[PDB]
Amino acid sequence: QLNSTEISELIKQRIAQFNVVSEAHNEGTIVSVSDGVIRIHGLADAMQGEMISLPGNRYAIALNLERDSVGAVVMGPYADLAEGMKVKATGRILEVPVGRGLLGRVVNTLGAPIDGKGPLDHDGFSAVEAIAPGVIERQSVDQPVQTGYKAVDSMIPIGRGQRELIIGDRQTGKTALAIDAIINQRDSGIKAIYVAIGQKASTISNVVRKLEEHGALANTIVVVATASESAALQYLAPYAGAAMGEYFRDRGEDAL
């Protein structure tokens, strides 16, 4: 049942959540723009890897802290910017939402939803840049990951926690094998994540539609960076995808 009253109540709740009192912030100015790279003057309090908020809803990543400038990259279409625009510093190091409420959603590498479903529910944030658990914290892999195919379960078996590279030429069945692996975990209690970097968009929609067609979609997170989008978004796509998978790992669950 679609219900107007519950939407109105939610909007009122957002008004209540808003805090009117302001907070002091360190500010800076865009100095130069080219190819998604940015040079910023100011931001004396910035840290490397920080998220800088630009005009609009777009963000940038601080890469170099030079003596008198900051080198940064825009996470979106950079053409709309111009020298002199004010940029504010969110102390947040690059972050993205995490939680089990993400299952069944299509999401941008910045955590924003790309599907028409609506706003996103998450169990806080996890950092995109982190160092993996050390040698003592690891455990031997001792459980199977049953994908659909006969060959790879018989000749090249994969254990939970293993890393296995599917390699071949173009139009050789790489994508089909991977998503059939996802689809066979539909009932095995293993959560699945699919990260699409640089694929043609129509492909991604068809893949999600086939995942839905077999009922696996409710067990998957899908992260999308199309071939049209800025190179920085593509470069950071797999790191965001990794940040989501670690949520299940650290709570004692299994993910693919």
Partner 1 sequence: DLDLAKASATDQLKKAKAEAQVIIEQANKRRSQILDEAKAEAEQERTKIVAQ
Ligand X SMILES: Nc1ncnc2c1ncn2[C@@H]1O[C@H](COP(=O)(O)OP(=O)(O)OP(=O)(O)O)[C@@H](O)[C@H]1O
Classify 53 as helix, strand or coil: strand
Name the residue nearer to ligand X (CB basis): 88 or 214: 214
E-assigned strand segments in 44-120: 50-53, 59-65, 70-74, 86-93, 95-97, 106-108
Classify 218 as helix, strand or coil: helix
104-108, long-range: CB < 8 A, 24+ apart: 104/217, 104/218, 104/220, 104/221, 105/221, 105/222, 106/208, 106/222, 106/224, 107/221, 107/222, 107/223, 107/224, 108/223, 108/224, 108/225, 108/233
Cα angle at 21 between 15 and 24, to 5 degrees? 130
# binding residues, partner 1 (CB under 8 A): 3
Q: Binding pattern to partner 1, positions 197-216, x when CB under 8 A?
A: ---------------xx-x-
- 73 touches 118 (CB < 8 A): no
Chosen from partner 1, Mg ion, ligand X, none, partner binding at 205 (C-beta under 5 to 8 Å by type)? none
Per DSSP bridges, beta strands 95-97 and 125-127 are: antiparallel
Q: Binding pattern to ligand X, positions 144-183, x when CB under 6 A?
A: ------------------------x-xxxxxxx-------
Chosen from Mg ion, partner 1, ligand X, none, partner binding at 170 (C-beta under 5 to 8 Å by type)? ligand X
- Closest approach of ligand X to the CB of residue 199, in Å: 7
- Closest approach of Mg ion to the CB of residue 172, in Å: 9
Q: Binding pattern to partner 1, positions 154-193, x when CB under 8 A?
A: ----------------------------------------
Per the DSSP assignment, residues forming a β-bridge with 52 are: 60, 89
Chosen from Mg ion, partner 1, ligand X, none, partner binding at 172 (C-beta under 5 to 8 Å by type)? ligand X
- Closest approach of partner 1 to the CB of residue 213, in Å: 6
Name the residue nearer to partner 1 (CB basis): 99 or 104: 104
- Closest approach of partner 1 to the CB of residue 196, in Å: 22
Chosen from partner 1, Mg ion, ligand X, none, partner binding at 35 (C-beta under 5 to 8 Å by type)? none
Per the DSSP assignment, residues forming a β-bridge with 113 are: 107
Q: Nearest 5°: phi and psi at 3?
A: -135, 125
Is 175 near Mg ion (CB under 5 A)?
Answer: yes
Residues that bind partner 1 (CB under 8 A): 212-213, 215
Residues that bind Mg ion (CB under 5 A): 175
Residues that bind ligand X (CB under 6 A): 168, 170-176
